Amino acid sequence: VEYRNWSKPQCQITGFAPFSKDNSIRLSAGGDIWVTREPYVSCDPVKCYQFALGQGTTLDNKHSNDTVHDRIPHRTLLMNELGVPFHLGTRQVCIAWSSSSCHDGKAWLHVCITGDDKNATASFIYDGRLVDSIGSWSQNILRTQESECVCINGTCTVVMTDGSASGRADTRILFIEEGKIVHISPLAGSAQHVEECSCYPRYPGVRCICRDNWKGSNRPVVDINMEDYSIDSSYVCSGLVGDTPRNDDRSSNSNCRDPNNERGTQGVKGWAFDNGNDLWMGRTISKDLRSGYETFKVIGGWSTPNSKSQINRQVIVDSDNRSGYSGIFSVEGKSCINRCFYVELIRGRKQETRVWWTSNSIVVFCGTSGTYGTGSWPDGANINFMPI
Ligand SMILES: *[C@@H]1O[C@H](CO)[C@@H](O[C@@H]2O[C@H](CO)[C@@H](O[C@@H]3O[C@H](CO[C@H]4O[C@H](CO)[C@@H](O)[C@H](O)[C@@H]4O)[C@@H](O)[C@H](O[C@H]4O[C@H](CO)[C@@H](O)[C@H](O)[C@@H]4O)[C@@H]3O)[C@H](O)[C@H]2NC(C)=O)[C@H](O)[C@H]1NC(C)=O
Ligand SMILES: CC(=O)N[C@H]1[C@H]([C@H](O)[C@H](O)CO)O[C@@H](P(=O)(O)O)C[C@@H]1O
Ligand SMILES: *[C@@H]1O[C@H](CO)[C@@H](O)[C@H](O)[C@H]1NC(C)=O
Ligand SMILES: *[C@@H]1O[C@H](CO)[C@@H](O)[C@H](O)[C@H]1NC(C)=O
Ligand SMILES: *[C@@H]1O[C@H](CO)[C@@H](O)[C@H](O)[C@H]1NC(C)=O
Ligand SMILES: [Ca+2]
After folding, report:
1. How far is the centre of ligand 2, averaged over its atoms, from the C-alpha of 143 (Å)?
2. How far does the centroid of ligand 6 lie from the alpha carbon of residue 61, in Å?
3. Which residues bind substrate?
4. DSSP string covering 256-283
5. Which residues are CB-neighbours of 322 under 8 A, at least 6 positions away?
6. How many CB atoms lie within 10 A of CB 245?
């Protein structure tokens, strides 16, 4: 078994085609299904798995009540083959209320974080064994990607951050080999805030589109040099803009260099990826809430500041249904490396007050160079049938 080096062109894509859906919440009304949030997907070189951070309880369980909280000692990282729902036979891989996993070609890496907010700890579990750990460096909630990491030639990269949510913070990029931290680089370039990065290979580098929870509704970009460990950061050029809350396609901007300061506070994990000068991206259909989800191509949205020439749009979830986080994952084809994405469909507490829990389902698409149609694929549950 050789290490993944991901050195193949990026497949030319025309849009994305449906790929998987787990119908988690619908099943929960008549089955024992894990309560989860912040899910994601990653594939080794043979099959794809679906991860999620559970809430140490099933839905039809009094313990689900008040699962709106993001960090309790009972959250663990669940892992199943893509498509099999989180039922009782699912393996809890580690203790973690924030995580990230990737396969380097020979084994899985799982960075798991738990602990007190002011003094959390992250364990780096590789190939089944705990190989290394690190502690909070800014005593204020050590957090990471919430999506897949990436490895080239045996070296994996995971961007992490400790600090303020809506304030300056400390973002570093750990370089890990076989579970062992072999280098740590600090964020450089012009990105103000970096959280929940959605990274992907780009031989010989890795590129990420993250979340700015402080001053920007445009998304930050983090470029990682696997060779010398140098970092660089910017914001995506597109004037279309992918964070939530955001401005309005009409009155929204991005200069490629700084937080646009337009409805900058708060956000949502998301993705985007480059294609020559164009950019592929997705985002909630609403600008205020996490409702609906669409994807499209912004002609010259990677290279030219403020571009808004959109085309090839697809609605994944209609504007009347809930969505949530979302991220990207790469799969190696025979001749090129393709890009896919999943989208979390949060249901429950916060927006929906009939029930007392909070959970999610998922729907996942992959790029295609072929043809495709139209549709919409939401969570699907009826809050009125649900327990609680
Ligand atoms: C964030 O998380 C880290 C890692 O857990 C915490 O650091 C550890 O803190 C504990 C508690 O202080 C350390 O364990 C204790 O070590 C003491 C000795 O260290 C001092 O004294 C020696 C004397 O030779 C010096 O060499 C050394 O430099 C220190 O000055 C022990 O005395 C402690 O035992 C006593 O206290 C405990 C309660 O604290 C009692 O219950 C015991 O009965 C006993 O009386 C204890 O063993 C530990 O070593 C630290 N880690 C490391 C790597 O050093 C942080 O405290 C935490 N931060 C926050 C904000 O929560
Ligand atoms: C480690 C951690 O707490 N992650 C949480 C993250 C942070 O709150 C923001 O990243 C602020 O920095 O966001 C929430 P969200 O529902 O969007 O509010 C879900 C995550 O559990
Ligand atoms: C990438 O890996 C394959 C085998 O895994 C090898 O044939 C190819 O030459 C490698 N390319 C680089 C740039 O390492
Ligand atoms: C859920 O918890 C709250 C307080 O923790 C309580 O008031 C409420 O009645 C609970 N409801 C159910 C249905 O468990
Ligand atoms: C991966 O390995 C090949 C073969 O050893 C090497 O030439 C290539 O540059 C490596 N790539 C990176 C990004 O280290
Ligand atoms: Ca923001």
Report:
1. 9
2. 35
3. 37, 71, 195-196, 211, 290
4. SSS---SS-S------EEEETTEEEEEE
5. 290, 291, 345, 346, 347, 351, 378, 379
6. 18
Q: This structure's resolution (angstroms)?
A: 2.4
Q: Please tell me the distance from the alpha carbon of residue 142 to that of residue 336, in angstroms, as a whole number.
A: 35
Determine whether 342 is an active site residue.
Answer: no
Q: Which of 198, 209, 151, 176 minimizes the C-alpha distance to 6? A: 151
Domain spans of the chain, in order of start: 1-388
Closest to 279 in 3D by CA, of 312, 248, 255: 312
3 CA closest ligand 3 atom index: 5
Structure tokens at 299: 């002609």
- Among all bound ligands, the one having the nearest atom to the CA of 68 is 2
Task: Provide Rg for the chain, Cα atoms.
Answer: 19
The structure was resolved experimentally with: X-ray
Any idea which ligand is nearest the CA of 161? 2
Tell me the C-alpha distance between 52 and 344, whole Å: 10
Q: Does ligand 2 lie within 6 Å of residue 71's CB atom?
A: yes
Closest CA to 100 of 147, 156, 38, 40: 147
| Residue with CA closest to ligand 2 atom 5 | 70
What does the alpha-carbon distance between residue 93 and residue 105 come to, in Å, rounded to a whole number? Answer: 19
| Residue from 17, 54, 30, 24 nearest 380 by CA | 24
Catalytic hit among 40, 49, 200, 325 = 325
Whether 117 is catalytic is no
Q: Are 295 and 267 in contact (CB under 8 A)?
A: no
Q: Is 203 in the pocket of ligand 4 (CB under 6 A)?
A: no
